Design an enzyme around this catalytic site. Sequence first.
Site, PDB file in Angstrom:
ATOM      1  N   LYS A   1     -12.690  72.148  31.315  1.00  0.00           N
ATOM      2  CA  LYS A   1     -13.824  71.558  30.672  1.00  0.00           C
ATOM      3  C   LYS A   1     -13.865  70.309  29.251  1.00  0.00           C
ATOM      4  CE  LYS A   1     -17.892  73.196  27.636  1.00  0.00           C
ATOM      5  NZ  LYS A   1     -18.072  75.264  27.595  1.00  0.00           N
TER       6      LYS A   1
ATOM      7  N   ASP B   1     -26.452  80.406  22.151  1.00  0.00           N
ATOM      8  CA  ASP B   1     -27.426  79.603  22.996  1.00  0.00           C
ATOM      9  C   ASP B   1     -27.331  80.542  23.717  1.00  0.00           C
ATOM     10  OD1 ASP B   1     -28.480  77.403  23.297  1.00  0.00           O
ATOM     11  OD2 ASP B   1     -26.599  75.717  23.874  1.00  0.00           O
TER      12      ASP B   1
HETATM   13  C1  LIG Z   1     -28.393  71.831  40.589  1.00  0.00           C
HETATM   14  N1  LIG Z   1     -27.117  72.035  41.059  1.00  0.00           N
HETATM   15  C2  LIG Z   1     -27.182  72.277  42.809  1.00  0.00           C
HETATM   16  C3  LIG Z   1     -26.732  74.153  42.893  1.00  0.00           C
HETATM   17  C4  LIG Z   1     -25.059  73.775  42.415  1.00  0.00           C
HETATM   18  N2  LIG Z   1     -24.514  74.437  41.007  1.00  0.00           N
HETATM   19  C5  LIG Z   1     -24.818  75.763  40.122  1.00  0.00           C
HETATM   20  O1  LIG Z   1     -25.409  76.228  40.330  1.00  0.00           O
HETATM   21  C6  LIG Z   1     -23.226  75.009  39.563  1.00  0.00           C
HETATM   22  C7  LIG Z   1     -22.941  76.664  39.496  1.00  0.00           C
HETATM   23  C8  LIG Z   1     -21.344  76.593  38.814  1.00  0.00           C
HETATM   24  C9  LIG Z   1     -21.020  76.150  37.847  1.00  0.00           C
HETATM   25  C10 LIG Z   1     -22.718  75.200  37.388  1.00  0.00           C
HETATM   26  C11 LIG Z   1     -21.855  74.582  36.388  1.00  0.00           C
HETATM   27  C12 LIG Z   1     -22.524  73.672  35.355  1.00  0.00           C
HETATM   28  C13 LIG Z   1     -22.082  73.426  34.183  1.00  0.00           C
HETATM   29  C14 LIG Z   1     -22.093  74.140  34.492  1.00  0.00           C
HETATM   30  C15 LIG Z   1     -21.361  74.633  32.791  1.00  0.00           C
HETATM   31  C16 LIG Z   1     -20.066  75.116  32.452  1.00  0.00           C
HETATM   32  C17 LIG Z   1     -19.244  75.051  30.969  1.00  0.00           C
HETATM   33  O2  LIG Z   1     -19.864  74.827  29.767  1.00  0.00           O
HETATM   34  N3  LIG Z   1     -18.485  76.212  30.846  1.00  0.00           N
HETATM   35  C18 LIG Z   1     -18.190  76.821  32.141  1.00  0.00           C
HETATM   36  C19 LIG Z   1     -17.143  78.002  32.725  1.00  0.00           C
HETATM   37  C20 LIG Z   1     -16.876  77.847  33.652  1.00  0.00           C
HETATM   38  C21 LIG Z   1     -17.820  77.452  35.252  1.00  0.00           C
HETATM   39 CL1  LIG Z   1     -18.236  78.160  36.826  1.00  0.00          CL
HETATM   40  C22 LIG Z   1     -18.927  76.169  34.642  1.00  0.00           C
HETATM   41  C23 LIG Z   1     -18.704  76.269  33.282  1.00  0.00           C
HETATM   42  O3  LIG Z   1     -21.379  75.260  35.485  1.00  0.00           O
HETATM   43  C24 LIG Z   1     -23.121  75.500  38.323  1.00  0.00           C
HETATM   44  C25 LIG Z   1     -24.753  72.598  40.926  1.00  0.00           C
HETATM   45  C26 LIG Z   1     -26.243  72.445  40.443  1.00  0.00           C
END
Ligand SMILES: CN1CCCN(C(=O)c2cccc(-c3ccc(/C=C4/C(=O)Nc5ccc(Cl)cc54)o3)c2)CC1
Length: 272
Positions: free
Chosen positions: A34, A134
């Site tokens: 990040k 949040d």
């Molecule tokens: C719509 N599109 C298609 C579906 C697949 N897909 C997801 O659902 C998906 C799967 C894994 C993560 C994320 C995601 C987006 C934004 C973030 C933000 C994070 C943050 O602020 N701290 C974190 C720590 C660990 C992780 Cl793994 C993520 C974050 O995480 C999104 C993309 C969305």
Amino acid sequence: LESQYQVGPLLGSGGFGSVYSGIRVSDNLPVAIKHVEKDRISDWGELPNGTRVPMEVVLLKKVSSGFSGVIRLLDWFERPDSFVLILERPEPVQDLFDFITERGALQEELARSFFWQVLEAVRHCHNCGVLHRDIKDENILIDLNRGELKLIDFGSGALLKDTVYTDFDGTRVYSPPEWIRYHRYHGRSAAVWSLGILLYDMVCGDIPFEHDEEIIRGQVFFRQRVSSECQHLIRWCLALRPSDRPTFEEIQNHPWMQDVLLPQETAEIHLH
Ligand SMILES: CN1CCCN(C(=O)c2cccc(-c3ccc(/C=C4/C(=O)Nc5ccc(Cl)cc54)o3)c2)CC1
Ligand SMILES: [Cl-]
């Protein structure tokens, strides 16, 4: 150097920064990387070493034991214009807002399992001295194999205290009426309000209040069939007077919250 992680694609970006998928080169550990621009950082804070850092790092270290309900900070780097945090990455994983969008309203049983886990996690932050501020479906990840939720994004959070907060930078439509009317809130009672919004979002497939006026009036209409016990719980979290809201203890003892599935059963029945 950060030459010790292989970087993959952008997972998402927004008010939290830009977050990339990655793998730790050391052991092929899946991670999330990040990036947060120094210009864009809200509060700053204080590490033992003496080093100055984003409050987010302080908050994550205070909370990052191995309790899996909160995301673990594995490392961080400072760059000239930015901080980079390495976070644990479950896989496969899906964020709760996505899960609800693809699935619509969740069955009560699965909403209960998920809501209980979110409650355990928020109690964890509070015991570690941290207020998330949040809480919402987008800040919750589902580890789909294990059926375990993890709270993420502590970038709008604060040290937990017992006196009044007069600043807030999370999400408006999850924020309680006393913020909207007086710009003042207490930590735990605001957190409980946002948990009411979250629980409504799970069982109805959308948030209950789009506008300031609706938040302040606090009437709750259910657009899906939702059981009386769950409606009661939600309406209690969404009491207008903060001190009429339940404590975490009263929410976890509520009748709707009894007989929760273990996370692994939850995965087997509802996610596998
Ligand atoms: C719509 N599109 C298609 C579906 C697949 N897909 C997801 O659902 C998906 C799967 C894994 C993560 C994320 C995601 C987006 C934004 C973030 C933000 C994070 C943050 O602020 N701290 C974190 C720590 C660990 C992780 Cl793994 C993520 C974050 O995480 C999104 C993309 C969305
Ligand atoms: Cl606001």
